[PDB]
Design a protein around this nucleic acid. Structure first.
Ligand code: MG
Ligand code: MG
Ligand code: MG
Ligand code: MG
Ligand code: MG
Ligand code: MG
Ligand code: MG
Length: 101
RNA sequence: AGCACAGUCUUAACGAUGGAUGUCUUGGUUCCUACAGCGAUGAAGGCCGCAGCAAAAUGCGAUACGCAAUGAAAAUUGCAGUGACUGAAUCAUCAGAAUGCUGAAUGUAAACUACACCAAUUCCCUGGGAAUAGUGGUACUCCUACAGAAA
């Protein structure tokens, strides 16, 4: 069991680890994403390469009035994660789209 | 409106082709002088990023072609925008802050963003109130000290 008289390294700086702002970067337009928004209430977000599904969900919860049933993700060949977020039935992605912009 | 045979060869003039010559020169080279190490406080090297419109190089590191601070000091400009009337636009300086993933690489791994285990960790306010699966730590060898067990 450790009992160091002082800790070795103490990062006093504000955390570098990615917050909501930084994790999730921006929604996608593109005809595909628009279609998704219209038809099956799935919002498409470009996110950081090092976002997990859990993390993305958390971000979405924090950044917007969104509850997400399921999140699929993929790594784009442009070095971004694209997260397809299916909203719970209580919410209309269209309305939330409008709210965001 | 006419007249040259055509080809081959030659000469001259005027052009094409090419990049010689000459002229340059933010480069090299040599010599001289001067200092002289970086790294578990994570080096060099490598990746991945980072610009409003951004490929390379250049610079930088999730504060990402820069932050603070200092010394200049009114511009910057391709457009957009940002500034002056001096901690501000731009330079230099650079001591503060920060410094992604790696790499000796060091928790086990490695064509894995695979996997353990131990601390949960972090921030705010003057003992509470908030967050986030996030953050640290754990290599081998060695030294001094301590520990309680072994002969
Ligand atoms: Mg998948
Ligand atoms: Mg003839
Ligand atoms: Mg030496
Ligand atoms: Mg400054
Ligand atoms: Mg000044
Ligand atoms: Mg390792
Ligand atoms: Mg394998």
């Amino acid at each position: 069991a450790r009992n160091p008289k002082c800790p070795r390294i103490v990062k006093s700086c504000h955390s570098k680890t990615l917050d909501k702002y930084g994790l999730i970067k921006y929604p996608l337009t593109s005809e595909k994403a628009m279609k998704k928004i219209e038809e099956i209430n799935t919002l498409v977000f470009m996110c950081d390469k090092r976002a997990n599904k859990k993390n993305i969900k958390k971000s979405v919860k924090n950044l917007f009035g969104i509850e997400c049933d399921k999140v699929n993700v993929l790594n784009t060949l442009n070095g971004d994660k694209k997260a397809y977020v299916r909203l719970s039935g209580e919410h209309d992605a269209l309305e939330v789209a409008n709210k965001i912009g």
